[PDB]
Amino acid sequence: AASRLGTSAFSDAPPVELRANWSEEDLETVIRAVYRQVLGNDYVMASERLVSAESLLRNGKITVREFVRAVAKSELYKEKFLYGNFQTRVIELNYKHLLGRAPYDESEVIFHLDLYENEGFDADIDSYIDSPEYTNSFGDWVVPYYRGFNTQPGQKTVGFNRIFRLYRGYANSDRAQAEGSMSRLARDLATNRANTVVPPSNSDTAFAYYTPSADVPPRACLGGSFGESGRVYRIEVAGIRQPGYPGVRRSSTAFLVPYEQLSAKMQQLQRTGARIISVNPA
Amino acid sequence: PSGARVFRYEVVGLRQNEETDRMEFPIRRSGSTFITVPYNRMNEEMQRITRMGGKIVSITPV
Amino acid sequence: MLDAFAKVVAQADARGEFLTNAQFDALSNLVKEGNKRLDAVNRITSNASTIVANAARALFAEQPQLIQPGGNAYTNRRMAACLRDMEIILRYVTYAILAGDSSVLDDRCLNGLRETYQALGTPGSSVAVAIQKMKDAAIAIANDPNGITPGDCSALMSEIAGYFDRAAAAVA
Amino acid sequence: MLDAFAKVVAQADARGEFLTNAQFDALSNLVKEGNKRLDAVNRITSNASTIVANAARALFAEQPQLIQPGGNAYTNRRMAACLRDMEIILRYVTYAILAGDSSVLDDRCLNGLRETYQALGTPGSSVAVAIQKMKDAAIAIANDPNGITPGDCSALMSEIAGYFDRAAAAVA
Amino acid sequence: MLDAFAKVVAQADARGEFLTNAQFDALSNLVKEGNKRLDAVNRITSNASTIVANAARALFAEQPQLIQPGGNAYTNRRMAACLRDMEIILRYVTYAILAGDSSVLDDRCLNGLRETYQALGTPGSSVAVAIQKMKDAAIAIANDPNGITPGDCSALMSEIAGYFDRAAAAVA
Amino acid sequence: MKTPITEAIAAADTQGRFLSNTELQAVDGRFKRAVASMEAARALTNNAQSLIDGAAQAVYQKFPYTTTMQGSQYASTPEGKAKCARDIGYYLRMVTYCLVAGGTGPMDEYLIAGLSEINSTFDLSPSWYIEALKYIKANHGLTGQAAVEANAYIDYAINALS
Amino acid sequence: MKTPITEAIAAADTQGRFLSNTELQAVDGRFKRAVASMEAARALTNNAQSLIDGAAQAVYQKFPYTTTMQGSQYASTPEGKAKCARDIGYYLRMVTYCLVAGGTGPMDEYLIAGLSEINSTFDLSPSWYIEALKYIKANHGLTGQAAVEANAYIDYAINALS
Amino acid sequence: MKTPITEAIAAADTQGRFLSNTELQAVDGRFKRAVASMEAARALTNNAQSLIDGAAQAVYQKFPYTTTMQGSQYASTPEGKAKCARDIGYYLRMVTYCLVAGGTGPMDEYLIAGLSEINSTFDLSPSWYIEALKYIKANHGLTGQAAVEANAYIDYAINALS
């Protein structure tokens, strides 16, 4: 299941280490890929590229690790993400761009935030860059890639869910996303709450399903529900627009429905135009 | 300024496949490798190179 | 990395002269015998695994010191490494055959390979013996005259032998 | 990374002695002529592009070997690199002139550059000639008296020339 | 890195023969007096700060040039660095003592420490003197006759002195 | 360079696997097309001088102002006419390198890289060379699939300059 | 290697702190158990020859096809019987090493590393060694906690082969 | 499932009340009848194969046309005869389930749950299964309370099919 989830093809690793480290062409590719991963697929204009770093990069004086750090600490990166977002959101973006994953638990935010508060941002990026994870998955000669999709390293299951919150498509950039300018994985991270996977748009209608548990039914039924034979299936929906009496209200929401009624409820929801995000047993 | 003044490190061939099996990328060449280390990260870089294994041949202030 | 075509055009660009008629006809000769080159590389790559495995068995039979305790092809981890490097050399030589030039063989192999073996303490002479065993195996499989259209490909076989020899000399 | 004031304090810290009266009057002279220094750096920075471009035209006329095919400047990639490095050297030397010392210039720009060019194969002597071309251009436009409060600052111009010369000698 | 048990196993693996009875009894003797080793490491770690501080006072009394202006330990930042490195070598020697072999001491740390100081300009001889001061301090704290069940620990004391000596000789 | 042969080799090298039939098929296609490619290269090189001078005059006619306005970036002086001839000769020599290499490798590495930088610093507007390449593409005097491939490379250069 | 003492040392090294009392307690427990571990190691090495020979016969009985099938990777030849007496001996030797080291370090460094690769290149079947290890675990003739430790290492190897 | 026990539990749950004496009396009646129910279930499963075989032959005799007339609904092929055996086996298994459950719950949940819809879509005739159930109701070979309860459940199925 590749196309719907969004992982079109992320199925190899681009090193630059070679006898021909320049390789006369391959270095161009490596530079592009670093820009795509570190700057979050931002469209960097030609004039503002970090020419000084690339100089040392071909010369061999700096490794790919040093190149990634140079971009990460350069003001090019800072203007896009660091200066303009909530600090916790910046921590999330750092995890996405440098270590190719999402925060697995609240302790990650605790540690990185404390670094930022005392040592400064430069030290925060340093910690990501030289963390054991970066040193192992990548190797100072391998451009960072989104390894969060693969589960081989050893990670909390929630990680998979969480990475799909940050990656909202191949085309998407974190400077320009549906929920941008505010924390995307903050309220959930404190409560260790799982997230339903929101597939990115693909030649069909899209309705980004925000999931604030402030006003939603619980994940479980927490009762007998209607009491009819069979368990209680929780159905989510986003784009409810047709029946606006005061204005529909809470256009994106979930309903806990007993099994026997699901069919009926389904058609009602389809009538309003909302595309059901998920139907999970509760 | 308690910085700059970079030092070049020269590294003995990392035997590899000895406590570094976990490393994802396979090392492609051992030894005859020069790494530009800055003064501020010199402490950490010593730790990393030695933890991986191997030795340092020479250190040249540039 | 410059394959044969790329090599000739690169030197001609360094001199700054339009490709001369002699160079054109040399390249046309290369294309005329290209099918043979492709056939040879296909046959070598189809038996890659068997080539490496048989050569390895022969090497450890002829030089038991390697697999005796305390030797460099002991511990089953170093055995895996040795097999890996033999097949790596075979892979890059097949790349070279397809290219028609030794550029790939020297770039991403043999360049700072002698030093790595020398620092690890692995005998480079034994590595050369292994390369030679693989040379005989590959040249035989690449000149096997049964199952294919007839012809003479001795020139290409000598070229293959030259690549293997270059590698063996560079490591020993 | 030091500037002129930092240079005198660093020396005095090495000796362990309070700033001597000679150093005090030297730095007072530096500040009394500070506006001159600022004007010079402003003029050079404002004309950076034209300085580099004119110097480049002159260089590729006085050493046609570099431009002629097979010279370290053909291929239009290496041409871009040459222009890039000329501008880089100008940038760091302007940093130095604003600072008033050469520490910034020798810490980043020419800190081993000679070895880099020696390995690349680019002649360091020609690079020095290019730096000299830039030197005369920049000196001329900084000493241009047309449209500014008058007053002789030959000393500052000599210092600018000295920094360019230090770079040119260090790269060759 | 290896420890005592690991060291004998590794030598036996190099030859390829099961551990002989003599090696078995040797390591059993080592583990029989292991509580001595634990006591020594516990006492040294509990007095780390005073060990380094007293040794530092003695070092700068014996070689005042270091704290005079312009010397390598001057300016209070390099003084902090000097204290840090003294504690670092103490820490790695403590690791070695708990292990029972100096393998860890020479495998991480002292692996080019001499070289790093030589490049920095820091006098290795002075470092050696400091290591000796710490040697006396540590042997005293680990050999104090008061506060523990009486017995013999002189063998381990000679071993500890040996580790400190190895560090001092490797850094100078 | 990005030569089809070495592109296949690199594709196999990044995945650490012996050359599969995929790469062999690619190289086979290159050898099949090489007959026409070499014919095209021979055609362009044999009449190279004629095409170079014709293109120079074409640019002079399309942009008369380039032959009159004073300045270093003009061919008003005989030295400027010489440099113009040298540049258009470079373009033709590079296209004949690309034809023989079998791909856009030569054009990419020995030209088209930082071309924007150079054309902006010395103020050589790309349009001049674009029109010159257009003349070459119209007067090359090739036929068949050889003409097709020669045109394709020329147009790659044209679009790269734009 | 992954010896208890050394892993405690590495754990302290990653934090950069002197060995705290927790680590010292751990290594003290190691030393306390070492007396029994070395007694078991002596017992295993004193009857090593009988164990190796018995395991070689056990695998011959479980897989008769392996003693008749012609080929290099079979014990149908006397050379193959020598190879069996070599490899089974290596596994028993590694078990004794693990017993002395108090951890799986030796097993990982000298056996398990790359075992998957080797059994595929030389056409060996892991099941052979698995059966041999089972025989060794049943005839080791140890008792008590020492027996528990030895059987744990043997089963580690068994599960690694599988 | 509409087991008597679970029915009482649900009746108390919808009112959020602790189990009153009335519910306890009902469950006691269940347990009183359960001795005969379990005896009957054991009897039916002891003769399960014989009962299914006999019922199969009964419908083959009562409707001979079903064993000759062409059509997927008919058993004019060995696979169709297998389907007949399978379905009468389903009915017998459901009867045993209902006997142990002490109620018609199992019969309603795993059968009699759109039986009309399915037989109509396939166009299979209810009469077939009705006669098969009749044979089972006569050949069950029970006596006493067990007999009356088992025949009651079989008749429930019969009237539900119509």
Ligand SMILES: CCC1=C(C)/C(=C/C2=NC(=C\c3[nH]c(/C=C4\NC(=O)[C@H](C)[C@H]4CC)c(C)c3CCC(=O)O)/C(CCC(=O)O)=C2C)NC1=O
């Ligand atoms: C500290 C700032 C800094 C400097 C100084 C620097 C120098 C520098 N110049 C380079 C290239 C180059 N530099 C030149 C320069 C020249 N060619 C000539 O004919 C002239 C004589 C001369 C200019 C006056 C050329 C031709 C190359 C290209 C080498 C190549 O790719 O083949 C390279 C090779 C790798 C690359 O192009 O990125 C480096 C590292 N890099 C830096 O980051």
Ligand SMILES: CCC1=C(C)/C(=C/C2=NC(=C\c3[nH]c(/C=C4\NC(=O)[C@H](C)[C@H]4CC)c(C)c3CCC(=O)O)/C(CCC(=O)O)=C2C)NC1=O
């Ligand atoms: C935009 C910069 C920024 C802010 C503001 C921020 C807030 C923030 N404050 C936190 C903790 C906290 N913040 C407070 C704050 C307070 N407790 C009180 O009793 C007071 C009323 C109040 C202070 C006056 C407390 C108690 C915690 C700890 C919560 C916990 O561990 O459960 C945490 C939890 C993670 C951690 O402790 O590392 C976050 C994310 N994070 C940020 O990056």
Ligand SMILES: CCC1=C(C)/C(=C/C2=NC(=C\c3[nH]c(/C=C4\NC(=O)[C@H](C)[C@H]4CC)c(C)c3CCC(=O)O)/C(CCC(=O)O)=C2C)NC1=O
């Ligand atoms: C490879 C597949 C792919 C696509 C398609 C893609 C789209 C894409 N277009 C963007 C920007 C943009 N897209 C447009 C597009 C347009 N504005 C208009 O007026 C027109 C109607 C229209 C062009 C037809 C603009 C103006 C921006 C810049 C917005 C900004 O950065 O502020 C951005 C992010 C902001 C940025 O440029 O940094 C992305 C991610 N990203 C991808 O990876």
Ligand SMILES: CCC1=C(C)/C(=C/C2=NC(=C\c3[nH]c(/C=C4\NC(=O)[C@H](C)[C@H]4CC)c(C)c3CCC(=O)O)/C(CCC(=O)O)=C2C)NC1=O
């Ligand atoms: C009492 C609290 C309350 C709020 C806040 C509320 C919001 C609200 N506004 C809606 C519609 C809408 N709201 C807008 C609003 C805007 N369109 C624009 O172009 C602007 C950018 C923006 C105003 C400046 C639009 C266009 C729709 C219709 C969307 C559609 O039919 O697709 C809908 C969708 C269903 C409907 O139309 O009834 C909701 C739920 N409803 C509520 O009951």
Ligand SMILES: CCC1=C(C)/C(=C/C2=NC(=C\c3[nH]c(/C=C4\NC(=O)[C@H](C)[C@H]4CC)c(C)c3CCC(=O)O)/C(CCC(=O)O)=C2C)NC1=O
């Ligand atoms: C793809 C490019 C590439 C090349 C060329 C390459 C060669 C290469 N082979 C190596 C090791 C090795 N090579 C061997 C090979 C041998 N053992 C023997 O007994 C024989 C004499 C010989 C084979 C015939 C062994 C055993 C090692 C590992 C040494 C060790 O673990 O101690 C090493 C040292 C680090 C390592 O183990 O990887 C390199 C770099 N590696 C590469 O990634």
Ligand SMILES: CCC1=C(C)/C(=C/C2=NC(=C\c3[nH]c(/C=C4\NC(=O)[C@H](C)[C@H]4CC)c(C)c3CCC(=O)O)/C(CCC(=O)O)=C2C)NC1=O
């Ligand atoms: C964890 C293993 C490890 C070791 C062993 C190590 C040594 C080490 N000590 C250093 C600094 C230093 N070390 C000293 C040490 C001394 N100065 C003296 O006067 C005495 C003779 C001596 C102490 C007795 C000094 C003065 C510096 C600062 C040098 C400078 O930048 O000026 C530096 C240079 C980078 C820096 O820290 O500023 C290294 C690499 N670094 C490491 O990461």
Ligand SMILES: CCC1=C(C)/C(=C/C2=NC(=C\c3[nH]c(/C=C4\NC(=O)[C@H](C)[C@H]4CC)c(C)c3CCC(=O)O)/C(CCC(=O)O)=C2C)NC1=O
């Ligand atoms: C996908 C890559 C690829 C392969 C593998 C391939 C095989 C291939 N080999 C061919 C011919 C041939 N192959 C050989 C090969 C040999 N003659 C000998 O005596 C030797 C023992 C052996 C070489 C070592 C010869 C002589 C011809 C015919 C003449 C020629 O093409 O030069 C031909 C052309 C005529 C034909 O057989 O259909 C093809 C297509 N073609 C391909 O496109």
Ligand SMILES: CCC1=C(C)/C(=C/C2=NC(=C\c3[nH]c(/C=C4\NC(=O)[C@H](C)[C@H]4CC)c(C)c3CCC(=O)O)/C(CCC(=O)O)=C2C)NC1=O
């Ligand atoms: C949690 C880690 C840990 C520690 C630290 C520890 C201490 C410890 N040290 C002991 C013995 C001992 N302690 C010493 C210590 C000394 N004797 C001398 O004469 C010297 C002055 C001095 C060297 C420091 C000696 C000689 C023994 C004798 C028993 C033996 O050698 O194993 C004993 C056994 C008898 C006793 O309780 O004293 C314990 C339990 N036990 C532990 O489990």
Ligand SMILES: CCC1=C(C)/C(=C/C2=NC(=C\c3[nH]c(/C=C4\NC(=O)[C@H](C)[C@H]4CC)c(C)c3CCC(=O)O)/C(CCC(=O)O)=C2C)NC1=O
């Ligand atoms: C192989 C890749 C490559 C290219 C493309 C290349 C072009 C190139 N042409 C140049 C100059 C020039 N080229 C021309 C050419 C022309 N005059 C005209 O009237 C026409 C419109 C035009 C020809 C179509 C002129 C006038 C200059 C001098 C510009 C100046 O000095 O200001 C220069 C500046 C340095 C010099 O004088 O050589 C470069 C780098 N050099 C290269 O190595």
Ligand SMILES: CCC1=C(C)/C(=C/C2=NC(=C\c3[nH]c(/C=C4\NC(=O)[C@H](C)[C@H]4CC)c(C)c3CCC(=O)O)/C(CCC(=O)O)=C2C)NC1=O
């Ligand atoms: C120190 C750890 C270590 C291990 C484990 C190891 C395994 C190992 N077993 C091998 C072969 C072999 N292993 C066997 C073993 C068996 N044959 C059978 O019929 C049985 C079922 C089974 C024994 C019970 C045989 C017959 C060979 C030779 C196969 C050949 O030469 O092709 C080889 C190939 C080299 C050789 O011929 O010895 C290795 C590397 N090598 C090592 O260095």
Ligand SMILES: CCC1=C(C)/C(=C/C2=NC(=C\c3[nH]c(/C=C4\NC(=O)[C@H](C)[C@H]4CC)c(C)c3CCC(=O)O)/C(CCC(=O)O)=C2C)NC1=O
């Ligand atoms: C446990 C609940 C349950 C019931 C009740 C059940 C009955 C049942 N019997 C079926 C078919 C069938 N049943 C038969 C059986 C017979 N052939 C005869 O000659 C007789 C008259 C008759 C036996 C009385 C045949 C031939 C079919 C296939 C009819 C077709 O494919 O159209 C089918 C259609 C799907 C299939 O091919 O199996 C169902 C659903 N399946 C169930 O899961």
Ligand SMILES: CCC1=C(C)/C(=C\C2=NC(=C\c3[nH]c(/C=C4\NC(=O)[C@H](C)[C@H]4CC)c(C)c3CCC(=O)O)/C(CCC(=O)O)=C2C)NC1=O
């Ligand atoms: C606050 C922003 C800012 C400014 C305005 C600046 C430049 C600057 N140029 C100045 C004047 C001047 N500029 C020149 C330049 C020259 N004239 C000549 O005939 C010589 C050839 C040459 C000396 C090399 C001279 C002589 C003065 C007057 C003396 C001086 O203050 O420098 C002055 C003093 C009077 C004034 O305000 O104009 C300033 C502040 N640097 C800055 O950062």
